[PDB]
């Protein structure tokens, strides 16, 4: 069967600029290829189709090209509302393939991030839990690292990490890690840091605390 | 008025037999066939196969053939999808989508999400998130969801009335349970003068936490 592979997954670009999403197949598929947009909420609704013919409904602003084996989808100028994930489809031969899939992203100055630690709750701690929270909120670009150092040791185990999409407003990202570990684990030492490495800063940005 | 209606959310056990269905409605069902789409959470689409409403005749994919079925009722005009002996592979959303000329899917379903886990039905426990003991213009609250299932839960800060400056952070899997937090930045001079609120609402266990962020001391 077909390879269809979309060479970025990620792509970034400002509001009102022209972008393009190139999509490759390991074989010709004779312009037999579609396009399709999955909004962040999930839902999947059809664009291109026969890699140049607009679908009803589509704004006039999206366009397809390419033949043999290479196409592309073309936004004349990006909208808000075109902030989304877009797959590309061949039905040349069955069975139908999807690409990787290329998320688009606003380009923005870089921000750097609003680091703040949250020592495990009382609450918690009379259940024998103790996680300790640390987030970074509103920077750019997506790339970040977190480091956790406990009484001066790097802490690489038991880490929980979630990042959000782009923001809606702002464009910015944000990170949330979490220390998980028990009431025993935690008493055990007493200084907790929350290291912060960015492309914004030559020095990272420290967060710490005491059991004291 | 033509849309695909898929079933709800499924919870199994690894080994069960999972079945999802696909009402059609606004159009002649047996004028086009019926597409399978698979999505593995935080991946991309993922094409199962179609099924021929006149014929009943299945056209399976590549990874798609063995444990997986289809089939329909054309006197109800819904089409089946069912997946036999569950792994944990099989976690993700499956839509459905009805087929067209030049070979496209149009008219997706809002997609059926199937989540393959041993982890029972549990409520989360809610924790606020006080800052340390000590200045700034600024003040950032927190507020922890640990240790749930299944998906989703809903988090909200003042009833609604606190939404700027919310950053809720999606559900993480650990040790088959789901874990969430979430931070909202205020003002110096709005906390701890107004009461800050954090809640959270599980359906799946009829769970309703609210839990106001107390300063340490």
């Known amino acids: 069967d077909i390879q269809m592979t979309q060479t970025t997954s990620s792509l970034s670009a400002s509001l009102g600029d022209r972008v393009t999403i190139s999509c490759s197949a390991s074989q010709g598929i004779s312009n037999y290829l579609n396009w399709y947009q999955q909004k962040p909420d999930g839902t999947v609704k059809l664009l291109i189709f026969y890699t140049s013919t607009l679908y009803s409904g589509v704004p006039s602003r999206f366009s397809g090209s390419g033949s043999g084996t290479d196409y592309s989808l073309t936004i004349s100028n990006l909208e808000p509302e075109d902030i989304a994930t877009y797959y590309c489809?061949?039905?040349?031969?069955?069975?139908?393939?999807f690409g990787g899939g290329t998320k688009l992203e606003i380009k923005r100055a870089d921000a750097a991030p609003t680091v703040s630690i949250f020592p495990p709750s009382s609450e918690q701690l009379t259940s024998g839990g103790a996680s300790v929270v640390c987030f970074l909120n509103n920077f750019y670009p997506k790339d970040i690292n977190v480091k956790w150092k406990i009484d001066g040791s790097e802490r690489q185990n038991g880490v929980l990490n979630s990042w959000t999409d782009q923001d809606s407003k702002d464009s910015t990202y944000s990170m949330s890690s979490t220390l998980t570990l028990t009431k025993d684990e935690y008493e055990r030492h007493n200084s907790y840091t929350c290291e912060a490495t960015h492309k914004t800063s030559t020095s990272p940005i420290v967060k710490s605390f005491n059991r004291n | 008025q033509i849309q695909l209606v898929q079933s709800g959310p499924e919870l199994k056990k690894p080994g069960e037999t999972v079945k999802i269905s696909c009402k059609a409605s606004?159009?002649?069902?047996?004028?086009?066939?019926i597409n399978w789409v698979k999505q593995a959470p935080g991946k991309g689409l993922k094409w199962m196969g179609w099924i021929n409403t006149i014929t009943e005749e299945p056209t399976f994919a590549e990874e798609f053939t063995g444990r997986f079925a289809f089939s329909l009722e054309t006197s109800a005009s819904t089409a089946y999808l069912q997946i036999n002996n569950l792994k944990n592979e099989d976690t993700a959303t499956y839509f459905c989508?009805?087929?067209?000329?030049?070979?496209?899917?149009?008219?997706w379903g809002q997609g059926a999400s199937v989540t393959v886990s041993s982890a029972k039905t549990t409520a989360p426990s809610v924790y606020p998130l006080a800052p340390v003991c000590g200045t700034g213009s600024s003040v950032t609250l927190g507020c922890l969801v640990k240790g749930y299932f299944p998906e989703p839960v809903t988090l909200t800060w003042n009833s609604g009335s606190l939404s700027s400056g919310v950053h809720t952070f999606p559900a993480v899997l650990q040790s088959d349970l789901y874990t969430l937090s979430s931070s909202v930045t205020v003002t110096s001079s709005t906390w701890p003068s107004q009461s800050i609120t954090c809640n959270v609402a599980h359906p799946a266990s009829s769970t309703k936490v609210d839990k106001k962020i107390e300063p340490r001391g």
């Open positions: 989508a009805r087929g067209s000329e030049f070979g496209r899917l149009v008219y």
């Open positions: 606004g159009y002649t069902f047996t004028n086009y066939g």
């Open positions: 489809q061949q039905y040349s031969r069955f069975p139908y393939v």
